[PDB]
C-alpha cells in the first residue's frame, strides 16, 4: 500500500475499534443511568458489561496495533488488581494487553461491582418493604381512650414485621446479598469469601449463614427482630384489639423502635455509598478504555 492513508490500522481493525467505542459508551451510559434497584435493571447492567467485554476480546483477537504510551497507559490502569474481593490494586505485547484489560475489567465488573449491584438491589427491596409497613403506623396508633395513654395495634404491627423478617429469613435469590443468586439452586461461597465481603460491606456476623457446602451473606435481620422482641415486650394486647399503655411506656418503646429503624437506615447508607464508589471505580476504568481507543483512532498519517 503506497497510497496515503489516515491510520496504520486496518479497515477490519477500524471496524473493531469503532464497535468497541460504541459498546464502551453504551455500557458507560447504561451503567450511569440504570440504577441497581431491580433484578431486570441488574441484568441490563450485566449485559452492557458483557458486550463491552466481547468488544474487547474482538480487539485482542483482531490483534489491533497500539502505541507505546497507549500500551503503558492501558497496562498501568488495569494490571495487578482484584485481590481478596477487596479493592487491592516487562515488554508486554499488544495482543497480550487487550487480553489483560478484557480479563481484569471483567473480574471487577463481576466479582466486585456485580456484587454491590446485587447487594443494593436486595437491600433496597428489603428496606422498601420495611418502609411500607412503617406507613401503616397511621391507623395503628391512636391516643389513649382517656387522657394520657396510647393504643398500639401491636398485633398487626407485629404480624407485618414478622412476615418481613420471615421472608428475608429464607435463603433464596431474593434474600442473599452474596454471592449473587444466578439460576435455580442456591449459590454458596467459601467462608473466607463470605467473611471477606462481610467486612467489605461492614456487616455483622449475623448476616453470615451457612448453606450446605458453603456460606452466604444475607441482609441484617437483627433490627427488625429486636423490634418484634420489644413489641412482644409491651405485654400481650387487650382481648383482640389494641394494647393500651401509658406515656412513659409508649415513649420508651417508640424511641427504641426508632433506634432500630435508624440502624437499618445506617446499614443501607453504607451499602449504597460503597456501591457508589464501586460503580465509580469501574467507570474510571471505562474512561481509560475510551481514552485509549480514542487515541488509537487519531489521524496517524
Author numbering: 32 to 120, 127 to 338
The authors write:
Bacterial infections including Salmonellosis and Shigellosis affect millions of people every year. These bacteria use a T3SS to secrete virulence factors to manipulate host cells. The T3SS is a multi-component system that forms a continuous protein transport channel through the two bacterial membranes and the periplasmatic space that extends into the surrounding medium by a needle structure. Tip proteins, which bind to the distal end of the T3SS needle, are thought to play an important role in this process. SipD from S. typhimurium, IpaD from Shigella flexneri and BipD from Burkholderia mallei are tip proteins that are thought to interact with their corresponding needle subunits PrgI, MxiH and BsaL, respectively, to make the needle tip complex.
